[PDB]
Amino acid sequence: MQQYLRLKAQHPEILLFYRMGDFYELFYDDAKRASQLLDISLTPMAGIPYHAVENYLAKLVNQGESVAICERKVVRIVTPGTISDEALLQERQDNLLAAIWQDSKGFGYATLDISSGRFRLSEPADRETMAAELQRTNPAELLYAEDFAEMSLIEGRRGLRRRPLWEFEIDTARQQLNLQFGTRDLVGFGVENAPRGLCAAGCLLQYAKDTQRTTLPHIRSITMEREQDSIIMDAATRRNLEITQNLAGGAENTLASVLDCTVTPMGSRMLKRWLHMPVRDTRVLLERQQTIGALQDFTAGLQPVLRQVGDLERILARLALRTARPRDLARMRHAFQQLPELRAQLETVDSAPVQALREKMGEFAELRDLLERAIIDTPPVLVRDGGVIASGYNEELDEWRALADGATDYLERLEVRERERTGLDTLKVGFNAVHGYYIQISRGQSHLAPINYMRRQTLKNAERYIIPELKEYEDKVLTSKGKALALEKQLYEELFDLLLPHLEALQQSASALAELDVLVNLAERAYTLNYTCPTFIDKPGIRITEGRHPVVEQVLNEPFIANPLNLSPQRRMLIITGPNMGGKSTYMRQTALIALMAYIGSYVPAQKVEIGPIDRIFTRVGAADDSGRSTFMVEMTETANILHNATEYSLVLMDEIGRGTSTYDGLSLAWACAENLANKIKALTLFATHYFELTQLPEKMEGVANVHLDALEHGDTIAFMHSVQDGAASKSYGLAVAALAGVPKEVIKRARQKLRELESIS
Amino acid sequence: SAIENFDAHTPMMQQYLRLKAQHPEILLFYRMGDFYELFYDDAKRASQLLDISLTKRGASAGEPIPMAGIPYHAVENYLAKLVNQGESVAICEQIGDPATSKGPVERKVVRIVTPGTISDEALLQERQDNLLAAIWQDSKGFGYATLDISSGRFRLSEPADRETMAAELQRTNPAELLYAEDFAEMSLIEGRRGLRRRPLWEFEIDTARQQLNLQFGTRDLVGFGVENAPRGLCAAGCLLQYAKDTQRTTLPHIRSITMEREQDSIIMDAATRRNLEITQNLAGGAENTLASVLDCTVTPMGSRMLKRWLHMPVRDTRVLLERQQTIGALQDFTAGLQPVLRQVGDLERILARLALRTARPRDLARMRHAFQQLPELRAQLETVDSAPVQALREKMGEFAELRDLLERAIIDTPPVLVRDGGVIASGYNEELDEWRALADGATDYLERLEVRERERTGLDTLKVGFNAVHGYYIQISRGQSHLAPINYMRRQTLKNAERYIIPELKEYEDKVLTSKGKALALEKQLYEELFDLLLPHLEALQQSASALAELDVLVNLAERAYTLNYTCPTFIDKPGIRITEGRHPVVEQVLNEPFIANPLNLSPQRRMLIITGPNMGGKSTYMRQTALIALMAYIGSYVPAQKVEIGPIDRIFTRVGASTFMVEMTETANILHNATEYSLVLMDEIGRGTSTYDGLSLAWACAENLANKIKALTLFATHYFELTQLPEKMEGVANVHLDALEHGDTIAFMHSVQDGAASKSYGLAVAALAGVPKEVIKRARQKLRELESIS
DNA sequence: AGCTGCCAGGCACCAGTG
DNA sequence: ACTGGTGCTTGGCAGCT
Numbered sequence A: 001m002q003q004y005l006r007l008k009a010q011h012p013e014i015l016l017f018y019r020m021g022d023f024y025e026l027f028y029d030d031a032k033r034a035s036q037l038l039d040i041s042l043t044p045m046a047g048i049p050y051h052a053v054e055n056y057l058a059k060l061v062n063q064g065e066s067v068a069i070c071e072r073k074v075v076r077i078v079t080p081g082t083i084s085d086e087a088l089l090q091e092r093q094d095n096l097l098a099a100i101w102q103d104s105k106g107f108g109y110a111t112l113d114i115s116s117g118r119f120r121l122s123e124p125a126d127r128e129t130m131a132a133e134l135q136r137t138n139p140a141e142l143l144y145a146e147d148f149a150e151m152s153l154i155e156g157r158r159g160l161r162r163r164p165l166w167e168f169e170i171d172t173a174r175q176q177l178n179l180q181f182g183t184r185d186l187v188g189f190g191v192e193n194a195p196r197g198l199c200a201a202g203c204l205l206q207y208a209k210d211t212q213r214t215t216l217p218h219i220r221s222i223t224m225e226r227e228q229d230s231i232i233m234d235a236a237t238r239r240n241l242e243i244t245q246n247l248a249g250g251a252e253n254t255l256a257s258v259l260d261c262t263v264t265p266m267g268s269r270m271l272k273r274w275l276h277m278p279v280r281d282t283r284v285l286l287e288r289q290q291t292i293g294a295l296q297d298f299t300a301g302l303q304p305v306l307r308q309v310g311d312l313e314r315i316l317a318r319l320a321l322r323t324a325r326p327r328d329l330a331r332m333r334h335a336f337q338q339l340p341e342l343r344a345q346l347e348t349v350d351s352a353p354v355q356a357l358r359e360k361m362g363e364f365a366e367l368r369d370l371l372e373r374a375i376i377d378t379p380p381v382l383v384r385d386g387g388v389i390a391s392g393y394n395e396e397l398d399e400w401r402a403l404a405d406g407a408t409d410y411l412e413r414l415e416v417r418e419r420e421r422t423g424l425d426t427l428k429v430g431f432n433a434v435h436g437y438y439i440q441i442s443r444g445q446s447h448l449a450p451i452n453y454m455r456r457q458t459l460k461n462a463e464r465y466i467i468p469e470l471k472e473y474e475d476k477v478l479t480s481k482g483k484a485l486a487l488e489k490q491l492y493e494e495l496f497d498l499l500l501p502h503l504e505a506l507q508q509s510a511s512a513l514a515e516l517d518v519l520v521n522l523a524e525r526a527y528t529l530n531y532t533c534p535t536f537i538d539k540p541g542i543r544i545t546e547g548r549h550p551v552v553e554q555v556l557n558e559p560f561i562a563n564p565l566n567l568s569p570q571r572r573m574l575i576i577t578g579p580n581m582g583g584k585s586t587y588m589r590q591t592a593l594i595a596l597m598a599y600i601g602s603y604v605p606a607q608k609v610e611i612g613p614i615d616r617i618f619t620r621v622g623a624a625d626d627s628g629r630s631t632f633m634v635e636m637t638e639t640a641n642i643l644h645n646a647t648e649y650s651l652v653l654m655d656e657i658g659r660g661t662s663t664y665d666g667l668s669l670a671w672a673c674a675e676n677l678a679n680k681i682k683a684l685t686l687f688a689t690h691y692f693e694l695t696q697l698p699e700k701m702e703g704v705a706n707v708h709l710d711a712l713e714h715g716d717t718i719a720f721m722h723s724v725q726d727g728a729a730s731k732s733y734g735l736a737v738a739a740l741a742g743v744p745k746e747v748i749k750r751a752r753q754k755l756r757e758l759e760s761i762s
Numbered sequence B: 001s002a003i004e005n006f007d008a009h010t011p012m013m014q015q016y017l018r019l020k021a022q023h024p025e026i027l028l029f030y031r032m033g034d035f036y037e038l039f040y041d042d043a044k045r046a047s048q049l050l051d052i053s054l055t056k057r058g059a060s061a062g063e064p065i066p067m068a069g070i071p072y073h074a075v076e077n078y079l080a081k082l083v084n085q086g087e088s089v090a091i092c093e094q095i096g097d098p099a100t101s102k103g104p105v106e107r108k109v110v111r112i113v114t115p116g117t118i119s120d121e122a123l124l125q126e127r128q129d130n131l132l133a134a135i136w137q138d139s140k141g142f143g144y145a146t147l148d149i150s151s152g153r154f155r156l157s158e159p160a161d162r163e164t165m166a167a168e169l170q171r172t173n174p175a176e177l178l179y180a181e182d183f184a185e186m187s188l189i190e191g192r193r194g195l196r197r198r199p200l201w202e203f204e205i206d207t208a209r210q211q212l213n214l215q216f217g218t219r220d221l222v223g224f225g226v227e228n229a230p231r232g233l234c235a236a237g238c239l240l241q242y243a244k245d246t247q248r249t250t251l252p253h254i255r256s257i258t259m260e261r262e263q264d265s266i267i268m269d270a271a272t273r274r275n276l277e278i279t280q281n282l283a284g285g286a287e288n289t290l291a292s293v294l295d296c297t298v299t300p301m302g303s304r305m306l307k308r309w310l311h312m313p314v315r316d317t318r319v320l321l322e323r324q325q326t327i328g329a330l331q332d333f334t335a336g337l338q339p340v341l342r343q344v345g346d347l348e349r350i351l352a353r354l355a356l357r358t359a360r361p362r363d364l365a366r367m368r369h370a371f372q373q374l375p376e377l378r379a380q381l382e383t384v385d386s387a388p389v390q391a392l393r394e395k396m397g398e399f400a401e402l403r404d405l406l407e408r409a410i411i412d413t414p415p416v417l418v419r420d421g422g423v424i425a426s427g428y429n430e431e432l433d434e435w436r437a438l439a440d441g442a443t444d445y446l447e448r449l450e451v452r453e454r455e456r457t458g459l460d461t462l463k464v465g466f467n468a469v470h471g472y473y474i475q476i477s478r479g480q481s482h483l484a485p486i487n488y489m490r491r492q493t494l495k496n497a498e499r500y501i502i503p504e505l506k507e508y509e510d511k512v513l514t515s516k517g518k519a520l521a522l523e524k525q526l527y528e529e530l531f532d533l534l535l536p537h538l539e540a541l542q543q544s545a546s547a548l549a550e551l552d553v554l555v556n557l558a559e560r561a562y563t564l565n566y567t568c569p570t571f572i573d574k575p576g577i578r579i580t581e582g583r584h585p586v587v588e589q590v591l592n593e594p595f596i597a598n599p600l601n602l603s604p605q606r607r608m609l610i611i612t613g614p615n616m617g618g619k620s621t622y623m624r625q626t627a628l629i630a631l632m633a634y635i636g637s638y639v640p641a642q643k644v645e646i647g648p649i650d651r652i653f654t655r656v657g658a659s660t661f662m663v664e665m666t667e668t669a670n671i672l673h674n675a676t677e678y679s680l681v682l683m684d685e686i687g688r689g690t691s692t693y694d695g696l697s698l699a700w701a702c703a704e705n706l707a708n709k710i711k712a713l714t715l716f717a718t719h720y721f722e723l724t725q726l727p728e729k730m731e732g733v734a735n736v737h738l739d740a741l742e743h744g745d746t747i748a749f750m751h752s753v754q755d756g757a758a759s760k761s762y763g764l765a766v767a768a769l770a771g772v773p774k775e776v777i778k779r780a781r782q783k784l785r786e787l788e789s790i791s
Numbered sequence C: 001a002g003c004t005g006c007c008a009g010g011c012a013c014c015a016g017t018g
Numbered sequence D: 001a002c003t004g005g006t007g008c009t010t011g012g013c014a015g016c017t
């Protein structure tokens, strides 16, 4: 079997599936990696059943592996960043291709969603912004230049693809990009003067094209992302705020789990994009708020109708690629059938943005009518066997079908005729591939078959025969069906030619429907969850009245205690003191989440919110735990990131810095960090701490005040109160907890004596 | 909902529903000819779990019956999927003969496949024990029992409290856990796999005693050392009933039960076990564990045994000296013994299948292969001067007769199953050989008939063949078929060929199949007979496999000791630990650079060490290697050090600092309530409160209690410099630290333990190393000099 | 070597004579 | 009450290409 080997040499860096009967089999290393990735026997050879290959392809692709199929020649390849088949994608997750490269001036980065055609480029200012973008976009497949210096950024990621340096040449990029978009220059996309980014996108587009060997007419635009356009959040922050993913890798108990009740998969994905990239331009935000408010009373009637639109976005991709299947057209039709109802319901809404979405949504009455006449109500999965084109659409087809039915009705009458004649009740006509049509009689009656019957196949308990009057009509049936089938196929490909001219307007429509779904959803969440519209002020500041954690309040069956916050250039840092279980962390995270939601355009969980501009959010809240430096090391590294990068427009949340080292070292560090944040950086800061010594800071510097949480001892337990009050904590509860936990009474008494001794010299 | 009373059901469903009523909560594979079928909700569930098609069976009266099923010859693949998901499955077979049965043939559930009850090679993992366990509790404590169905090993214990019980669950890691319906502490078992709620009556003491005595063939349990332990007996009683219920045959390999007493082993709490990464690393994997380094056994039963020793260190001085002696004596015979031991394989699990009467042909083959290694092992070991080695050499036995039997009765390389014959070799039984002669006359005859008839008729396409559906035949092409003799009886028609039969061929066929059936039945009768001949020696055979496995462990431990440069530890009368040049057995293998060996001196005068040093300076490692060295000494193994003198240890406790604080405090409370002068306590950065000093205050109070009242051997790593003052105040406490060097803007970690407290805490240096701006560090150093001037 | 479809062996179900 | 045909799972492989 040197055929497999020599054929593997073609794509050596890609897993090779080799058709062997009703299975695909991998050999050698390929068998290895495959077994430990899919959990199957490493009998070296491994394999998977032909009827489940798409399942295993989805898994491999999900783990960043490209896969070449073979049936003997490489007839198909799938790469993680360029798949478009529904079976291989996850409904509610974006699947991106990206390219990264480094210049002497900085980084170049680009991403592509091969289904929607959403194409973005950027030029991250440094290793830190780059890391945040990599984490935010989370590409399924990453193209990188060989000479990539700072490999620490991408090493460890799945789907890494090393590419030759010549693939990142700008002259070639501009040309290829201009040709793809059909323009002479890129000025209209606002990227004409962004070479690094362009080099990344040029490489990406070429890879995509090579992977598809098809035109990509749905990729008609590209957009540049600027640092100042969005609130910046690093991986740790992004992780610690649990936006779309909890700290345990799951999806429950995240912000998305409470905010994302969209009715469409494209809506869901778009909402997740918004959550991860809050915008800083209040014009956009004011527009989103207005819409949220205007849509309120229309939510109930709009959602069930929007639900029927489905994932038009991804279907449209298969239309552009010419791989759409009968039920894709059926769903597109069904989606077109909702447009007039959506138009009529949106007509009354007093909102310029809603009216624009309403126009952008379109109608497509012609395409609607076409698919109504061309395809049957509930077509099969594939066109392969026909039965997709409805009767009455084409005259020829209608005829061939009438002949086949006629020849079929004859053979049915032939059966009843041959029965009464021969008088053999077991007699019937059946069809098969090997023998085509045939006549069957049971064994016990077979000896009475007419002499003109020719014997073709004996079964355990029956004989099958043929006669000329049989093979005659078999031809009438087979030749007819065959033509009908060929016709259906041609009529089906014709549907593509009639639909594709409107591709651009169809893409705008799906885009609009996706945005409506997002906005209608946020309108329903605000009204349902008692949110309020925040207002924007000129200078940095946050004023919350009765704010809540939007996730914790929906999960716990205990009353959530709402809390105020007042931060301004005059009251810039709060030293938060008190218990562990008291509510410090929650209180800090809800501040960040409220800021985030305000900068997505959504209403927020409070009675009132006034908030200034915010360039970035830092949350050093929660835990260390790495392969893993050490808790204190990590905690200090994240602190260093905040002190090097925060500005006066930053929101900073710090959670008991100092734990994990000596008392004096830890106290000295916390004091110094807090002083630098307050007097030099001047960022709006929530500084949680266990050090009572830090509560003297407000008497040493302006812009710093003490707030705290307290507890209540009652019965045989402790009730950690969750109300933030002014001033410093005056109690500690560590000994009380130790007593409840069963620490022997003698030890507690000795610890009490030691505590007072320690706290007094202070 | 149609009213589904008995009489409204067909005879099939009356029989089925009645059987299903005996296994209401588990899947029932129902034998229906060539398929095992499931119905109603079982069909829907099976459809989902096995990815098979959900169909239906029509009904004259009522709703159609949801149906699913698989070919009987493919059950083992489907059982695998089920058992790997924790599903039990009852296997119902046809008992009667349909030909002589009026209505439905008699059916019976002959076995229940469950996660902790499997014995088939295809369902188990070679190097992992698969245990069935049963648990229960009353007001004073817990009853617990375990059984390895593939070895007969039956154990009972009575964990005194919750942590002990939790530690035991973790140590034994049962694949199936039976628990009494009134269990109060569900937190102990809530998350486990194969959890099985059981009725209270299955834990009745009188019934347990009666059933255990019946199973062991005794009048009382005095001889097994468990007459005294009714709380454990209740659990074993539940367990044995479950085991008999799942196998539904005798279990002659379960001939004994042993009690595991506290005093007999070093009791390790859960945090200790998970923090020393004995067989599972902290990330749940098998990489870089104690076992990954020490387990180079060559037999699967040996690998299992070694992991059992690692988790259960023994406190019997005698056992320990004997193991050491063996390890020292055999050190030179390693290379010669291992290749031969490897060939004995997993005789333990094969013997279980023998006992269960499920052993397949290749099990007897491997058993035979194992018997053929004994003479060489006997020879290799006679020289080795060591009483314990000769005791093992004897226990191992030889079984010459049994070896010869299997050599005479089974072919060199038999097939996977007995079902289709070809297992019993020729010369073993004359009747069998005779019946086979007929079945093997096949091709001289068949070819002879073909030629003869081809020449006589002159039809060159003529051929003789066989078909399972239609039988033997003479084939002539459609073209020349019209020229066949009129004597030829038409049997089967094909598209381009015609098949016929003649009396001669029919007659040959009628005897080739009856004799084939005769041969196959005799083969199966003689295969069963092998069991009857082997079983009487089951007891001596189990002793043999047990000795073979212990030999594999000790031979392996001897090779590790030599290869990894270990030394033999000695034991002292009083609690204490004296290590010269000690290393962490795992860390020193993974780490790509020399490991810095360190000493340790613990005694009743020097019983608590306060350990300081910078982050990443080696604190946790130093503590962990102390525990591992102790652990390794108490399995009878040599140790990673230049020298080690160690006293008695009853328990090892661990507390690794980092809701929480509620758990940290609960656990430290457990330590203070249960540690003794013979305990080894490892406190890693404990004491964490809500303010500056409450946590430190508690760690201080805790340390004082450990030093002054309990007097246990304690290693107390901390970053609280305040605690370096303890030695001044308390007898028995001393300072040690991990050395670090600060040269300009860098910090080097020496990794070596020195006496006294560290010169300084390196928090600020470590923070500067983490990238914290120099301006901040400069402010912090200023703040620090204010604080340092208070005293 | 690559598709199709008969068969395996339980029991019940049904239409056609008693 | 008989007789003789139908159906239903999935794996194996005859029978045709």
Ligand SMILES: Nc1ncnc2c1ncn2[C@@H]1O[C@H](COP(=O)(O)OP(=O)(O)OP(=O)(O)O)[C@@H](O)[C@H]1O
Residues within 6 Å of the ligand: A552, A556, A558, A559, A560, A561, A562, A563, A578, A579, A580, A581, A582, A583, A584, A585, A586, A587, A655, A656, A688, A709, A722, A723
């Ligand atoms: N405002 C609130 N109302 C009701 N419950 C709350 C509130 N805040 C917090 N909780 C509950 O209290 C629990 C503990 O809160 P949290 O982790 O924030 O305490 P903390 O010890 O003050 O934080 P840290 O010490 O980590 O800075 C949370 O799990 C949450 O369920």
Ligand SMILES: Nc1ncnc2c1ncn2[C@@H]1O[C@H](COP(=O)(O)OP(=O)(O)OP(=O)(O)O)[C@@H](O)[C@H]1O
Residues within 6 Å of the ligand: A629, A630, A631, B587, B591, B594, B595, B596, B597, B598, B613, B614, B615, B616, B617, B618, B619, B620, B621, B622, B751, B752
């Ligand atoms: N004796 C030793 N020889 C060589 N390397 C060592 C030694 N002890 C520890 N190391 C290495 O140094 C690292 C840090 O050790 P350890 O985790 O015990 O430090 P630590 O003092 O517990 O502080 P932290 O908890 O901050 O890591 C370990 O990963 C280990 O690889």
Ligand SMILES: [Mg+2]
Residues within 6 Å of the ligand: B619, B620, B621
């Ligand atoms: Mg440590």
